Amino acid sequence: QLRESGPSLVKPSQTLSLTCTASGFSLSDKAVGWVRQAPGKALEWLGSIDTGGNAGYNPGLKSRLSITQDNSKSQVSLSVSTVTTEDSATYYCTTVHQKTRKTFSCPEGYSVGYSCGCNCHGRGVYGPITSASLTDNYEWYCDAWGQGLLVTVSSASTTAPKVYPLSSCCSSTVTLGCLVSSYMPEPVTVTWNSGALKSGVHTFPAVLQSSGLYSLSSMVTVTFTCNVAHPASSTKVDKAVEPKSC
Amino acid sequence: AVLNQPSSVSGSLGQRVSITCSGSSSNVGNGYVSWYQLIPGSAPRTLIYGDTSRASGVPDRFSGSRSGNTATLTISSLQAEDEADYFCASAEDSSSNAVFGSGTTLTVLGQPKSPPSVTLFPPSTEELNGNKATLVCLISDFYPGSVTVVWKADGSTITRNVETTRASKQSNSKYAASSYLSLTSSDWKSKGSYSCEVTHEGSTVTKTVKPSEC
């Protein structure tokens, strides 16, 4: 389990700082990388820091990126300086497989000789026979992936939500709900009865109002309490929902 | 700067589809392409590494290949859970510099259709005490994921102060959506009827709240 921690809202032209740790494991013996995805765009490589402490970065973003470790290498940090609205993205922490091998290579239409450790055999401009070259082969892929942390770069400030109970007016199934209204930024988490409700719960994706605060709703098809958590504002509301007496 | 993938790929259940990944000699041409599967609500999952090697737990219906500067991810038999965004990737000039593909949204057709379930919630007493009134129309369990929502009040269509989300896939593989009618408290009490009309595949499911009984 990889966990990214840090703020979900950062003002423009400031520095975004994120930390990655592992639960169940240790990042000290593994290479750790950072990947982000802006809404409706492709995944983008940021950089990594291998077991040897050496950091590598996306060349187009190197001048704004800083990926560091601590003494134990148990936690890995990412810094993005001078952020703009284009830096709004979900940021993922990953473990990365990185190995550089040196193998003999040959030009087009040539193959390496048997059990060489070396000349190449084929047909081409080099002749029938030519000496092989030692070339670095780059092995790279992201192994484990964190859940990702959504970061919004915006001038708007934090806004705690207002939680309203939802109940039908005056049946086969009684449907209740909770309206998480006018909050900033994303996300919010919603559970019911402290997670004791396993099925029948539907939490809907948030809408962004002409205003500019988000709003979402969660509903249960059956006392019932929705546990609304907005970690950005350190808000936790457990709203009791009771159907109308009538 | 980015490997080229088709914007979207469609296929029906049990059919074979392929997703290509077009790069250059500097990345794909070196023969160590990886593939990743992004399902909403879940962490990204690595499917393939080293062009053809499958990650742990990945079904054998996923396979990878490469011809020159284009690599391919192949799903031999489509399943509904395979609906996701797929990304290829490769290192470039170093084991720390990597480039991802542009992404391919995969859709699996042929799933059973289903009408939307509609629930319309009136404003709560607490919100009404703040001189505001939000009507909440929750739409779920429909396939395909296309729905048209219309708000009405005493027989007249309401076009202002309406916010509707796009359809999003649920855990049971059908789609969900929600619509909001943000009114003032006095507006909510002025009309005698409010309706959320949800049209899906030519069929309309309507729910109505009457302020006189809420």
Numbering used by the authors:
A (entry chain A): 3 to 119, 125 to 177, 182 to 233, 241 to 264
B (entry chain B): 2 to 9, 11 to 216
Report text from the authors:
Under these genetic constraints, cattle have developed a unique mechanism to accomplish antibody diversity by forming the broadest distribution of CDRH3 lengths and the most frequent occurrence of cysteine residues in CDRH3 loops. Consistent with the five structures solved previously, the 7 new CDRH3 structures also showed a long “stalk” formed by 2 anti-parallel β-strands supporting a compact, globular “knob”, further establishing the stalk-knob configuration as the general structural peculiarity for the ultralong bovine CDRH3s.
Two or three anti-parallel peptide segments make β-strands or β-strand-like backbone conformations in the knobs, and the first disulfide bond forms between the conserved cysteine residue and another cysteine residue within the second segment. A typical example of this feature is the knob of antibody BOV-5. BOV-5 and BOV-6 have relatively short CDRH3s, which might be due to deletion mutations in the region encoded by the DH2 segments.
